[PDB]
């Protein structure tokens, strides 16, 4: 999404 757009914080893993 954001920092999980490169998963871990915001996105892909958790967008």
From Swiss-Prot:
Protein task: Inhibits catecholamine release from chromaffin cells and noradrenergic neurons by acting as a non-competitive nicotinic cholinergic antagonist. Displays antibacterial activity against Gram-positive bacteria M.luteus and B.megaterium, and Gram-negative bacteria E.coli, and antifungal activity against a variety of filamentous fungi including A.fumigatus, N.hematococca, F.culmorum, F.oxyporum, T.mentagrophytes and several forms of Candida: C.albicans, C.tropicalis, C.glabrata and C.neoform. Can induce mast cell migration, degranulation and production of cytokines and chemokines.
Protein name according to UniProt: Catestatin
Lineage of origin: Eukaryota, Metazoa, Chordata, Craniata, Vertebrata
Protein's gene: CHGA
């Amino acid at each position: 999404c954001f920092r999980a757009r490169g998963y871990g914080f915001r996105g892909p893993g958790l967008c």
